[PDB]
Structure formats: structure tokens, C-alpha cells
Design a protein around this ligand. Structure first.
Ligand SMILES: [Ca+2]
Ligand SMILES: [Ca+2]
Ligand SMILES: [Ca+2]
Ligand SMILES: [Ca+2]
Lengths: 584, 584
């Protein structure tokens, strides 16, 4: 088990700047002195020098806890020095506070030793330590239950922080709500036939209901954990660069440079879409030529490399575009990720459904250069070849291939030191990737399940694996993430709403086109869109009348002409006089 | 001027229950004793008995003011016994507090003498008194200025309360924003011709911009006056009836009876729409028969009576349907008013545009019974005959006819008594009617100005009269309204949004139909609707980055393994040893 270590710093020391780096080390050992953290130094392979830090004096930690509590109470996060026993401390919050003490600048109670901007550029990783016993128990418990109750998600929140807990709760809710589309698709595939308008309407209604119920559940969860409104607190980015400083004093960046850098996005998107469209058109032309006298499978198996290259390019562009706050930078990065992944994972199906189907006479030059009728039922089978194959490769590159890579690389207190040395080489866990994968799966169900009604069922099975598989990816395949606080899942709500709307637009058009005049198609699209809007309004209105959080908040709030009538017998007597005399 | 009188109670005493009513009078003179209000009794014509009440002891009034301030601070209305000088008192708030003291029940600090449910059913009117000097000065000032600055609206808020001030601010903003549609319509009428798509798009954009800017301005105004969030405070309705009482104890009404009464609305709406449709169809058939070998003018001049009858029926139905809170009852009444007025004022134009234009062969039996081609340009001129005529009759029945009626009815301290006796016979001022009229005018501009582009200009002129004329209607033609507090204009925002959306749908369809295939019309409608949605999103996003209220709120918030290394020189020395020995 752990030796009480709370944080580990790598601090690689290359021989090139042996003096300078050494000086930095001295500064580092001073920067951790004033805060009150005990530091020990140990050998680290690959010419590194692992330092272990942990809080020693309980008084300083209690003062920091009280300061953080007051800070969050001031901003409205909390509605309610022996308070530590009154509200029990948890591992996630304690680790977050220690990390803040390590990272926060001087003028805010901390000693900022962030590894990016200051002189100590040798530091590159600050991570907590894993718990093997808890990981083994967690895996064993989750692999032997049919479902996960709220207690397991609460334990995840207690240990690994709030972001991981929110992701797991969202995945569980999505998996439990995916049952209805699966049953509906099985019913439509067994008797209804193919390309049914009823299935499209039911899918739209299910998407609306799931989205609204998830919003309500996330509000309730945020209220329950006492992290309601943390999104309103801004956290400054250490890497933010400033040119002019104005007045509390806050650094200001000229917005013109930001807009100038932002406009570089449009050529990037145009080049990406042109190249990918050329690739998919060439692949489809080759497939059609082969049919006339596998390429889709080759494209599906070869797209991850191009996706990774574009992802690296997008992250570099986001880094170049200066951002002052963490939330804005994360939102911009998420938007770029979603756009690229949407294009890459949807353009093939869009071309198959809305180009090859309605008029297949436009790719004639491609066939002629390679050297005929269009199949309305092609897309259906193609959709299958897009689902199952993916469900295989996504299960390969995310589970077994990393294990094989780790096995290949791998092949008195030395046990703990060896364990931490092996742990320090892993990559930091990112929660955005799982969110993106789940959102893309939801989009598949939303706007392409009508072609192949059984598809949802397959996804359901995959979800039951993912809820465990991702857990394994955190157990052994990644280092412990830094516990942060998040009110909600973030900008993914906008992505889900956009995908639902696009699905409502697309499913009816696909049904009308594959079942067979422009007026009929336009009428079908209009009716589907307006039905979606009406269902959205009705579901919002119904769910507005259902939440214990507001009850608790209300309970807390509740718990927390003059002188002629001077007397009054005289007034009554004169009133009686008027009452008597009005009878005349 | 006034004799210091703060409130007047009529308390008509018919000779039928001379004893019983008299007993009630005694009870009344006791109910106003405990609170601390001086009561005087004076003769009232039509066998009535006017009582004047005013607060005498400053200590009780100060205590009530402090209690109200604490109550609103507890609910979040206020973010910030000599406090009266610290925050100056105003006539509107003082009158509201006195009215609450008169009306609030026993267990809440008041002495509830509401004139509806209790034994004192003889009471029928409690009203404040007008100020002739202030009214004359206000009329003279407003009739000699080209525009009204924020100071005049602030004075209105100080004197007549918050509801009237909000209505006047909304009317001023609407009048100032109506300039752009007028210029656009003049430009389109001078050179562009008739039935232009560009004008429809510009009208949609203007409606979106005006709605969003009004929302922002109303948020700012609510923050400035310190009445932000008063909508969240529920006020119990004295007329509410209960059957079973549960547990603080609150009365509960069986929702099944409420739904049973609510379902009576559908037959009412069906009967109203059928009767009105038959009427308009008959009028149009008569007009067409006369053309083949004025009726619209007769319909326009005769609709107010039917409108009033239906309005009385709707108010009776709303009274029958029991409601527990004031806001819900007001919202339901407003919804019924809007539905009825929308139908009555729009069905004629809808029938002319979407029935007579696309296929005029369906009313053939009507013409045959009375005993041919349709005119595409008819609706335009018809729209004119619907605007100007209305602008006349609405200016007649609302300004001059009430003055004539009052003149016909009319023809040591007796002057003040005579003035109050004449004042007590007027009807209570209602602010919903002006809101409904303005909303209907906005709907006219939104979805029927493309047929007659000049129409907006005419409306502009009318607005400049209304901003004064309505003021006159409060000066002499109505009694002083009870000053209440409102956060926003209320449910009229939903009506404005619905009217804007319907206008975006309707204007493009009218353009396409009157300019001449179903596919073209459907494409035009779809493009117009989606352009409206995109413009709405863009305007919301832009206006989200513009407000001194949040700055003030932020300013207020801001203002408010272990033992082997014990020392630290030893740690640095051992670190040096590692640095030296890693070179080998
Ligand atoms: Ca997976
Ligand atoms: Ca995953
Ligand atoms: Ca008028
Ligand atoms: Ca008016």
C-alpha cells in the first residue's frame, strides 16, 4: 500500500543543464518549504529524481480547508477550527486542496510551482498515487453485478473526484435508457419491415425524453454533492500570456489578435472537409467499380491514424490561440474535437444516403476513369458494416492493444519504488475521449438507426462492456487523474441537442428517399421537425412539474375634518346617526 | 388637494339588511382599530357610507416597513428603527403596505377585511385617492415633449407603482423600435414594389432584435428598481376555496376537479371558432356577391360587442375554475384573453390570405345561394381597410366616448367630498387591456405588414398618441390602481415569441402565394423558418456579451523512509549526492 505519500513530482534532470536544473531543484525544495509539506527525494529511472510530498502539520491543512470553504461559501457554492469533524473530509477534496496549495500563486496562500511558465521548466508531471487494494475491490465488485446503484457512483465521487463520477453517472443513465430504442428496433425489425416513419418518430421522442431526463438528473446530482454553481467560478490559466496590464489588476489580451487567430480555423475546416470528401468519394468509386466487374472496411480500419493527426493539429491550433480561462479553453478544444469527429465519422453515411441514393449519375466520371443502377437497400447493409466493425476495432485499440504495448515495454522498500517508477510512465487519463465516443454513439442511434433498426440493440451490449472496460482503463492503463470539480458534463449538452435535432431532420428524409417528388420530401421533413419541436415543448412542460434539491433549498431558506371625530365610540354613534337619517 | 387620506372604503348599506349590514359596520370599525389606522365616516350618495383611513402612529408603520423589508430580504428580493431615513420611502410602496395591513389576515400582522369571502360582503371597493396637481403637471409635461426620458418613467414608478411603470417603459421601447419597420416599409413601398421577400426577412430580423433587446432592458429595469425576483413570491388568493386541509398547514384542492373544469375550455373554443368562422365566411360571401352584381367595415364596427360578450364569458369561466394563487389565475385569464382576441382579430385576414387566394372555388355554394375569378392584389387593399378603420374606432371608444358618457352621467369641505363621491363611481384601471392591444399591434406588424408595407408607419403615429392617450385614461377616466410589484410584464413574452414565430412562417407564404407548385411554397416556408431560428440564435449569442446590474451584483458580492531525512539541508545534500552520482 501507499506510504502516506500524497503527491509525487518527477523533475527530470538532463545532464545538459546540470547546473541550471540543480539550481531549480534548490528553488523547488524551498517552494515546498513555506507551505508546510514534507518532502523526500528518491531515485528515478531515465535520469529523473522523484520527490514525494505530503501535508505534515494538521493546523495548516485545517486553515487551508477553512479558507477554501469560506471561498466557496462566498460564491454561493455552499448554502449552509473543529469544522473538519463536523463535515467529514474526503480523499478527492483533500487531494485537490493539496494540489491547489502546490500550484496556487504566492499572493493567494499557495506557492505556485506550475511546470510551464516559470523557471522550473524541468518539472513535467505532478500526480497522486493509485490504491491497488481499492482498485482490485472495485473491479471485482463491478464485474459481478448486473447493475450499479447510487452507492457505487458515490464511492467513485469520493475517491476519484467529481468529473469521473459525472461521466460514470451519465454512462449509466445512457445505458439504462438505451433499452427502449433496442426493444423498439427489435419490434420494427421483426414485423414492421424496413424504413418505417413510426420508428423515426419514436426515436425522436426517445432522444428528447432522454436529454431532458438527463438534464434533470444532472441538476439533482449537482445539488446533492454540494457542487451546484462551481461553473460560475473562473480559474486563471497559468499558460495565459499578456501584453498590456490594466486595472484588482487583471491581465488583458488584445481581442483583435484572438479573432485573427480564430479566423485561421476556417481554412483548416475547408481543407479537412475537402480532403476527407475526396477520400470517401474515391473509396466509394473503387467499391462501385469492384461491384461492376472491402474498401469501406479498409477505410474504417485506417481512419484512426488520420483522426489522430488531425486531433494533434487541432490541439496545437488551440494552444496557439491564447485563452485566459480554463473553461473557455476546454470549451474551444471540445468544439474542435466534436467538429472533426462528426465529419470523420458521419460523412461516409451522409454521402451514401443523400448522394448515391437520390441521383447516382454524378460519379460517372470516376467510374469511367476506373474503367449501372443505384441500390436503395444498400445503405442498410452498409450501416451494419459500419457498426459491428467499429465495435470490434474500438474494443481492440482501447483494451487489448494498450495491454500488449505495456507488456512489451515492461519486458527493503524497493517494491514501492519500482511500483511508482512503473506508474510514472503512464499517460494522464483524459475524460473527454469517453464523452466524445458516447456522444458519437448517441448520434448514430439518433440519425442512422432507422436504416438498421437492430443497431441500437448492439450498442446496448457494448455499453454494458464499456461501463466496466473504461473502469479497467483507469485501474491499470492510466495514472490517477487530478480531482477537479464540475457542475455538469459541460458543453456536451449543446452537442447532444444539435445531434438530436439533426436526427429528427435526417431520419424522415432517409425514410422517404429509401422508400421510393420534392414536395413530398419537403413536407415530410417539415412535419418531422415540427413534431420534434412540439414534443420538446411538451416534455419540458411536463418535467417542469416534477426535485428534492429545491425542497431542501426551500427548507433551508425557511429555517434561516380631523378633530371633530377623535374617539371611536363617537365615530360609531355618528355612524348610527347617519344610518338612521338616510332612511328619510 | 387631499386631506391626508390614504384609503377610502365605500361599504354600501342597502336597507334590506339594515341590521345585518350595520353589525358588519361595527365589526369593520373594530377591524381597523387594532392595526392603528384612524377612521372617519362621511356621507356617500347612492345610500353608501364612505370611510377614510390613514396611518396615525409612525411607530407601527415603521415596524410594518421593517417587517416587509425583512420579508423581501429573506426571499432574495433585496441583496443589501431609523432605516426609513436611510432608504427613503415612496408613495407607491407606502400605499401598498397600508393596503396589505388592511387586507392581510390576522396571523400575519394584518387584519384581513377582504371584501369577498368573509361576513363583510357589503364592502366592494377599496381605493386610494388621486392627486389633481400632479396629474395636471404630468399631462402638461408629457404633452409638450418629443420624447420621454428615464426620469419620467421613474416618476411614474414612484407615484403609480411598478406595473404601470413597466407598461409605460414597454410602450416607449416599442414606439422607439417601431421607427425601423416604418422606414423599411416606406423604402419597400417607394421603389421595391409589392410582396418582396427581402421585406419579410427584414421584418423577421427586426422582431427578433426587438424581443431580445426588450428582454435585456426589462432585466436591467427590474434590477435597478430592486424588484428582481418578486415573481418567485407566491400570494394567496382570498377567494380560493378548499375542501380538504392538510399539512405549515396549506389548503389543498383536488386536482381532478380542476382538470374537469379545465376540459370545459375545449367546447368553448370550438363553439367560438365555428361561430366566428361562419360569420366571416358569410360576410365575405356577401361582399363577393355585391362585387359580382362595406360588409367588412360593418364587421369591423360590430365586432367589439361580440368581443366583450366572449370576454365576460371567459372571465366567468376563469372565476368558476378555482385557482389558489394570484399569478396562476392572472396567467390563465391572460391566456384566454389572448386566444380569443387572436382569433377575433386575425381570422378574417387568415381566410382572405390562405383560402380566397389559393383556391377560391370552395365558396361557390355561398355565391350560388346568394344568386368569377380571385384577385391576388385584394388582400393588400383589404389590409388597409382593416388598419385605418380600426385606428379610428379604437381611438373613438377609448377616448371620446367615455368622456361623453361621463359628461352625460354628471349632467365647508363639500368640495372634497363631492370630488371623492364623483371619483368613487369610476371603474378600476386594468393594465391587461393595453398590453393586449399593443401585442395585437405587434402581431399585425409581424405577420401582415408585407402585404401593405406602409402599415407600420401608421402604427408609429398611433403609438405617439397612445403614450399620451393612455395617460389621460388614468388621469380622469379611471381610479388610482393599487400599486403592486411585478418583476416583468408577465406571460406576454410567450405571446410575443409565438407571434414572431408565426409571422416568420406566414409572411413568406403570403409573399409566395400572392406573387403568383407546392414544392416552392414548402421550400420558401422552410427557408424562412430556419433563417428565423438562426437569427434568433445569433442575436441571443451577441446580446449575451453586452449589463450594469450584474456589475453591481458582483461589486456587492466582492465587497461582502520518513525518519532518514528529517531536516532540509540534509535533503539538499543528499540531492546533490544523487546529482553527482547519476553521471556515472
Ligand atoms: Ca468502446
Ligand atoms: Ca470508452
Ligand atoms: Ca388606441
Ligand atoms: Ca391603450
Amino acid at each position: 500500500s501507499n506510504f502516506g505519500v500524497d503527491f509525487v513530482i518527477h523533475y527530470k534532470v538532463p545532464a545538459a543543464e546540470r547546473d541550471e536544473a540543480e539550481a531549480g531543484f534548490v528553488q523547488l525544495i524551498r517552494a515546498l518549504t513555506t507551505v508546510g509539506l514534507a518532502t523526500e527525494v528518491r531515485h528515478g529511472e531515465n535520469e529523473s529524481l522523484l520527490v514525494f510530498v505530503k501535508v505534515a502539520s494538521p493546523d495548516l491543512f485545517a486553515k487551508q480547508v477553512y479558507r477554501a470553504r469560506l471561498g466557496d461559501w462566498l460564491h454561493g457554492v455552499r448554502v449552509s477550527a473543529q469544522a473538519l469533524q463536523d463535515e467529514p473530509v474526503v480523499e478527492a477534496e483533500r487531494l485537490r486542496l493539496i494540489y491547489l496549495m502546490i500550484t496556487k500563486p504566492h499572493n493567494e496562500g499557495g506557492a505556485g510551482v506550475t511546470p510551464t511558465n516559470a523557471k522550473w521548466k524541468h518539472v513535467e508531471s505532478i500526480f497522486p498515487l493509485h490504491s491497488h487494494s481499492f482498485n482490485k475491490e472495485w473491479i471485482k465488485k463491478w464485474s459481478s453485478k448486473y447493475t450499479l446503484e447510487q452507492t457505487d457512483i458515490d464511492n467513485i465521487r469520493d475517491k476519484f473526484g467529481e468529473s469521473v463520477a459525472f461521466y460514470f453517472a451519465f454512462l449509466r443513465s445512457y445505458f439504462r435508457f438505451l433499452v427502449i430504442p433496442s426493444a423498439f428496433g427489435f419490434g420494427a425489425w421483426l414485423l414492421l419491415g424496413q424504413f418505417s416513419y413510426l420508428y423515426a418518430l419514436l426515436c425522436g421522442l426517445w432522444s428528447v425524453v432522454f436529454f431532458e431526463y438527463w438534464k434533470k438528473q444532472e441538476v439533482d446530482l449537482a445539488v446533492q454533492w454540494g457542487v451546484r454553481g462551481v461553473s460560475s467560478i473562473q480559474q486563471s490559466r497559468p499558460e495565459f500570456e499578456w501584453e498590456h496590464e490594466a486595472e484588482e489588476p487583471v491581465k488583458v489580451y488584445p481581442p483583435m489578435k484572438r479573432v485573427k487567430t480564430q479566423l485561421l480555423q476556417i481554412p483548416f475546416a475547408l481543407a479537412c472537409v475537402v480532403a476527407l470528401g475526396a477520400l470517401i468519394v474515391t473509396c466509394n468509386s473503387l467499391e462501385v467499380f469492384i461491384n461492376e466487374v472491402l474498401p469501406t472496411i479498409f477505410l474504417v480500419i485506417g481512419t484512426p491514424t488520420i483522426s489522430g493527426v488531425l486531433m494533434g493539429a487541432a490541439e496545437k491550433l488551440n494552444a496557439m490561440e491564447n485563452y485566459a480561462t480554463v473553461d473557455a479553453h476546454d470549451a474551444a478544444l471540445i468544439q474542435k474535437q466534436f467538429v472533426l469527429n462528426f465529419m470523420t465519422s458521419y460523412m461516409a453515411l451522409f454521402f451514401t444516403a443523400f448522394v448515391y441514393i437520390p441521383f447516382g449519375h454524378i460519379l460517372h466520371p470516376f467510374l469511367n476513369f476506373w474503367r449501372f443502377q443505384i441500390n436503395p437497400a444498400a445503405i442498410s447493409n452498409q450501416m451494419f458494416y459500419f457498426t459491428v466493425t467499429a465495435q470490434i476495432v474500438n474494443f481492440a485499440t482501447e483494451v487489448v492493444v494498450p495491454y500488449i504495448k505495456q507488456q512489451a515495454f515492461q519486458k527493503e522498500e524497493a517494491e514501492f519504488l519500482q511500483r511508482v517508477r512503473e506508474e510514472c510512465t503512464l499517460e494522464e487519463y483524459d475524460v473527454s475521449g469517453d464523452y466524445r465516443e458516447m456522444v458519437m454513439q448517441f448520434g448514430y442511434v439518433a440519425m442512422f438507426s432507422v436504416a438498421w433498426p437492430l443497431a441500437a440493440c448492439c450498442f446496448l451490449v457494448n455499453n454494458w462492456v464499456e461501463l466496466r472496460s473504461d473502469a479497467l482503463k483507469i485501474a491499470i492503463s492510466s495514472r490517477r487523474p487530478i480531482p477537479w470539480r464540475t457542475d455538469s458534463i459541460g458543453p456536451w449538452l449543446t452537442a447532444l441537442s444539435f445531434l438530436s435535432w439533426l436526427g429528427s431532420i435526417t431520419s424522415s428524409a432517409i425514410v422517404y428517399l429509401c422508400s421510393n417528388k420534392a414536395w413530398g420530401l419537403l413536407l415530410s421533413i417539415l412535419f418531422a421537425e415540427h413534431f420534434y419541436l412540439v414534443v420538446q415543448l411538451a416534455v419540458r412542460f411536463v418535467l417542469s412539474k416534477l426535485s428534492p434539491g429545491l425542497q431542501k433549498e426551500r427548507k433551508e431558506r425557511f429555517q434561516t375634518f380631523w378633530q371633530r371625530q377623535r374617539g371611536m365610540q363617537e365615530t360609531i354613534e355618528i355612524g348610527r346617526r347617519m344610518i338612521e337619517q338616510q332612511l328619510a
